[PDB]
């Protein structure tokens, strides 16, 4: 059922986002150790526990971006694009304000500690916790076409991993190896825009952070083009392109 | 036979804590480099041994909390329940002799050179080498949401991982994605309460610093509340809502 | 078809680049945090994503030491050898340019930052963000016998977890593994002459360096014997030596 | 045949001390940065490399401690014991010849930076590199005691994980399982006794340390008692438990 599907896609995308945004509170707030490559396992294994427990039931979409690529070249049903879409963004939003909730007291000592207003463009750092901002060296089309490239590759390979025409099948072993994938991208390109590659794992805890202090800069991340538009589209613009090259280049050689 | 799995689970909960608090306590008083994602990685599969251990005897519980909620959402024989929690308790407490008994030196060389009093408040950070204690920066309530969220995620994808009818079936793969699952909420949320999840790792060791002279901050962890309920409590009132919101959320679904 | 084959190298090939290159470049101008065994796993696991991808296709080879090899020891069609091998070099060339492209300014700040000059000796350290350089204490012969070493370490490896006649057939789990043996190789070895053991991933990006700025270093590393030779001919000299070594002493034996 | 299978086994065993070897070289002369858990990984998943090329020809024992235990519990045949043993000894040998060869000029260049004469008591820490020696905190008896109680869970859990009758086959997924044991093994008890194991894997090493310049203390490691005898009956006393227990406590529950 509809509902049962909606439910699922809310509680998947929260899941990554509550292991996700969990992750770099600990490093963020709580001084964990954790370099570029820890972080993006931890994110990527995340992904797939959240597909393990929503792929029998929705699909495991968790990701605005999917699942308007699967629309476009997998016959997905487009009555069910935006219940889908709606469900994704509510779930990771509910998830970062549980995780906030959870992380709270650190949260304060740590801007107390350190002298940080929350809501200065200072702050942007802290917001890091929630959704990805650009690294100081590129400006909005470079982040934007970063976006763009990697979710293409995540789409892509997302197809190859599930394509069981493809090789050896890969059976209950897809998840995890989607997981894996999603680290080797984080770990090369994270450092340019904090792989976002998924509207609703961006826009809803840009919204929370927004609501719980700090202000505008949680969605312009203190730029002069409001940087939340990249992780929205660029990442549409992306899986679209992913999943076309797919199709042309691999599938129809296969 | 009950007495059959009764060693198994005595044996399996006893093999995680080996490798549990042996890693811990070569970070703490051997030198070994160990970020969070280590800690946590090497906990979870060290759970996943666990399993592959003993499932085939006792289905591998290893957790007083997942016993119960076996028995009240998966028709666990109630005549087992306490003989397996006693078995775990069991097995955990001995471990963790077992890990004293092989770090004893280390012990007390790094007391006596940084001056610290085996049982005084200031000893509570070695006593993390077996069990659980709370972040600085949260109190009792606090913590016991945090080992409460945790543990019903940790019901919650055990009964996804192992639910055949969800999506296609993990096989082999299972003990090795739980504990991954382990190692995940480790690094998303150790940080707050050193994702305890399970009374039987948390107590059994517990019992053991009391004994081996850190005293009552063992049990209290030098806070007003003393602190071992929420190890003991929280994973037991998490499991149970982990396990209740599978089966409505996702298995009625399926 | 031979032409969607081509394609597929070519793809795969550029893809393992991209993710390999891509994290060298985070470590060096983007100031990641990576040890040995980071980078060396994600290499690996890059390389596996890139065989998921076209071994239904191409038969994944990514490696003109691999193709070459396979024609003189698993009847690989000689007349797809050069066409093979022509488009893992473009593929490599084109995703090492599309990782300049991406981290451009992050490059160029760093330079201005620490006073590099692209193209002097001191150069070669950024250019080894691209390709292999030799460690500084040893030299040409001795750099020629780690290549040949762990090519054919390599080699033997892919036959062995591919040769289905050997033990439990590995399945799906095949790129995987083959992915963590180059992880193995790359912390065991990796230290030496940055593990390159593919002709494709060295000379495609060394040309990439030299035509953006690095001059003649990006062929020589600075060294009176030009460098480029060890990684073009130790892999392949290397691969032919693993691939005899299996069937004589493996193969000849199941 | 019996000529195959010690063909095997030595290649075996030398594979695993290649790139087990290989990395604490890395570690301890080129700079590397390796943590506990890095270095335990390393040697586990070469271990589950060196068993997958081996294991369809002789079994994959790479191990002494292995070989006689399935010996005296498993039926192996007692005429090829000491074949399969001489064979083990033999390549773990080798390898260590090889990697020294290959990291030569990195061994010079250390001890002659920091001043280091090789065969004096403070060098036994590079002997390290080869082979293993206790920790400082620990005497004979001690480090005894922990090659005993980690073999024991070795063996027990080899058992375990390649027991078709406990729980779900692991099939394919068997030699990585191992190589994740070794793993944790090493993370939680490595500080103490650098995880041997294996009598081949240390007793090969220390007579090419001893040959190459390390003299007396590759065998002693400055200790009043030979601290080689350690490793080699410990883990020999501590696989026959190891395999004794499993049968008795978990087999014949089955
Ligand atoms: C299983 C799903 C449970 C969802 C619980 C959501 C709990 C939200 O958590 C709350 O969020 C507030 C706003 O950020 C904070 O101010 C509170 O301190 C925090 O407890
Ligand atoms: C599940 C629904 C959660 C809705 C968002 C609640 C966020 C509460 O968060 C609070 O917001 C206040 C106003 O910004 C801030 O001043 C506080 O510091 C912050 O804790
Ligand atoms: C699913 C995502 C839909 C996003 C629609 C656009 C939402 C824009 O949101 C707006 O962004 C501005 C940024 O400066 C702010 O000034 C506004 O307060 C904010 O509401
Ligand atoms: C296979 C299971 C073996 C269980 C052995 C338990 C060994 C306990 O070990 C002992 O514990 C004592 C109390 O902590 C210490 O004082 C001793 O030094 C130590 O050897
Ligand atoms: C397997 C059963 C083990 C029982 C617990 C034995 C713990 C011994 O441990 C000892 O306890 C003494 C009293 O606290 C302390 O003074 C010592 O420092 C400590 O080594
Ligand atoms: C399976 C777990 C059952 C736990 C039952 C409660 C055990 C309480 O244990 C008690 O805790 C107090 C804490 O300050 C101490 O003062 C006591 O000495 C101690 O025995
Ligand atoms: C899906 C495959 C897309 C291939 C795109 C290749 C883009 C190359 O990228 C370009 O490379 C130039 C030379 O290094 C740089 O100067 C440019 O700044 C960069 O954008
Ligand atoms: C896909 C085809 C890409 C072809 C290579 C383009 C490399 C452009 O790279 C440019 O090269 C210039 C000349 O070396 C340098 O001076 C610049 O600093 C560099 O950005
Ligand atoms: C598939 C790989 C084929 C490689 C053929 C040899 C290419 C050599 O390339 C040459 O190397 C010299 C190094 O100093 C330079 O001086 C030249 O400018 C460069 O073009
Ligand atoms: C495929 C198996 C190849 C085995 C090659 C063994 C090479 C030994 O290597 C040699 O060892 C000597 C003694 O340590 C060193 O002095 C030499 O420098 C080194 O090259
Ligand atoms: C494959 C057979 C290898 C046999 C062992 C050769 C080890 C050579 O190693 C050499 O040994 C000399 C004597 O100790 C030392 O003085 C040298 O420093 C050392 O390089
Ligand atoms: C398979 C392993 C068999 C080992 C048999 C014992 C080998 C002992 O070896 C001996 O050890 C002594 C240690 O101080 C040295 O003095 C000798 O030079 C050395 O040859």
Chains 1, 2, 3, 4 share one sequence.
Request: charged share 10%.
């Amino acid at each position: 059922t509809l509902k049962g599907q909606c439910i699922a896609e809310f509680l998947g995308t929260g899941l990554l986002i509550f292991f996700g945004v969990g992750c770099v509170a600990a490093l963020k707030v709580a001084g964990a150790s954790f370099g570029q490559w820890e972080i993006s396992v931890i994110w990527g294994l995340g992904v797939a526990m959240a597909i393990y427990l929503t792929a029998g039931v929705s699909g495991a979409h968790l990701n605005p971006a999917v699942t308007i690529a699967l629309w476009l070249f997998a016959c997905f049903d487009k009555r069910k694009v935006i219940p889908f879409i709606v469900s994704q963004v509510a779930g990771a939003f509910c998830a970062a304000a549980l995780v906030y909730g959870l992380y709270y007291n650190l949260f304060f000592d740590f801007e107390q500690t350190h002298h940080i207003v929350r809501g200065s463009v200072e702050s942007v750092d802290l917001a890091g916790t929630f959704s990805t901002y650009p690294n100081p060296h590129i400006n909005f089309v470079q982040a934007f076409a970063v976006e763009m490239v990697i979710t293409a590759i995540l789409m892509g390979l997302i197809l190859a991993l599930t394509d069981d025409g493809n090789g050896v099948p890969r059976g209950p072993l897809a998840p995890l190896l989607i997981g894996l994938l999603i680290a080797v991208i984080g770990a090369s390109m994270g450092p340019l825009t904090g792989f976002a590659m998924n509207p609703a794992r961006d826009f809803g805890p840009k919204v929370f952070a927004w609501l719980a202090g700090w202000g505008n800069v949680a969605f312009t991340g203190g730029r002069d083009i409001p940087y939340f538009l990249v992780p929205l589209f660029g990442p549409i613009v992306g899986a679209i392109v992913g999943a076309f090259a797919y199709r042309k280049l691999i599938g129809r050689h296969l």
